[PDB]
Amino acid sequence: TSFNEASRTSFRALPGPSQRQLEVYDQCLIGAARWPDDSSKSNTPENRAYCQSMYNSIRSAGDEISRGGITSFEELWGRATEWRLSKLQRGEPLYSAFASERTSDTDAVTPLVKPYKSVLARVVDHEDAHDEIMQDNLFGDLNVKVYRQTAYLHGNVIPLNTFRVATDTEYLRDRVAHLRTELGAKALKQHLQRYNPDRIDHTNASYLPIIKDHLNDLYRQAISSDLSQAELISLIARTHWWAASAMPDQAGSAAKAEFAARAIASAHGIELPPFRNGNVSDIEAMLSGEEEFVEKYRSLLDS
Numbered sequence: 001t002s003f004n005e006a007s008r009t010s011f012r013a014l015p016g017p018s019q020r021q022l023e024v025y026d027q028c029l030i031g032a033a034r035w036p037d038d039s040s041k042s043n044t045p046e047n048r049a050y051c052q053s054m055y056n057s058i059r060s061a062g063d064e065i066s067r068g069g070i071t072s073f074e075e076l077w078g079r080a081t082e083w084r085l086s087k088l089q090r091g092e093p094l095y096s097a098f099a100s101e102r103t104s105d106t107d108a109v110t111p112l113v114k115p116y117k118s119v120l121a122r123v124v125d126h127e128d129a130h131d132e133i134m135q136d137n138l139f140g141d142l143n144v145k146v147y148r149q150t151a152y153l154h155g156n157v158i159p160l161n162t163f164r165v166a167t168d169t170e171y172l173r174d175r176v177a178h179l180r181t182e183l184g185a186k187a188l189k190q191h192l193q194r195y196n197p198d199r200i201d202h203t204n205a206s207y208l209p210i211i212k213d214h215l216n217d218l219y220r221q222a223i224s225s226d227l228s229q230a231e232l233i234s235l236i237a238r239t240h241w242w243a244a245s246a247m248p249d250q251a252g253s254a255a256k257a258e259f260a261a262r263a264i265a266s267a268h269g270i271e272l273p274p275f276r277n278g279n280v281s282d283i284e285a286m287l288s289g290e291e292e293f294v295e296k297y298r299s300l301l302d303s
């Protein structure tokens, strides 16, 4: 019904970011990772500045969306990515990872070491955790609690993230002492970047093309001008879930997914509050099925 000449695309105008804004205290928590075992990083002035910048840029992106200036999820992710890159320090060796999509000839692993240790209990006490045994060229056989996150896409049920937590605590202490003595602390740390017994094995990058296409489909639904509030919050939660669980980039995906979900909300005049202390949104996504995440999304938010 309207036409954006700069993006050369027809769109239905949305209200855009709300005039009533979050309090500054909340602005400075947008995008924070408020771990339950340690929320202290989120109190520093550096982190507060990072978060308030995210908030301001989320609102600017919401304005672009409301005017037809961002026309696909991939473009919104690009905005989030360039914003995230701007916060890296001069010289950052991870700059390329923050700037780059993951590729298939790579596996991606998050060892569940600091700051992720609160996740170990969440896996062990998970309703959907299964007991399994994993074979391992350095540790041998290990009892693990495993959560296998899955997704429904066009009737294909695909594996997303797999959490493994090894439960033989004393045997592990023992076997790591052996490994450290035989290999050195840094070299073993290098091996465990991929094979730490406690870890998340991330969504295979081969799924990223179809997930990226699905995110574009969700975005097209989400910029509709005639959605109910429940429909809209459901679409925002689904977009967040898919983008965070896909983990499309070598670094920074959690920040980019939260940026994008909040920008979609802001385009509709919704000013979403911070995630509650203790709720790290990408981790909550990866630890749930999609419909479960949609049904609890509001409760993850601080009101």
Ligand SMILES: O=c1ccn([C@@H]2O[C@H](COP(=O)(O)OP(=O)(O)O)[C@@H](O)[C@H]2O)c(=O)[nH]1
Pocket: 031, 032, 033, 046, 047, 050, 250, 251, 252, 253, 254, 255, 256, 258
């Ligand atoms: O100075 C910073 C940088 C990042 N983050 C947040 O910490 C999380 C980091 O996860 P992400 O996947 O974005 O980055 P990566 O784990 O690849 O470094 C995200 O919620 C960021 O918004 C933060 O609170 N402060």
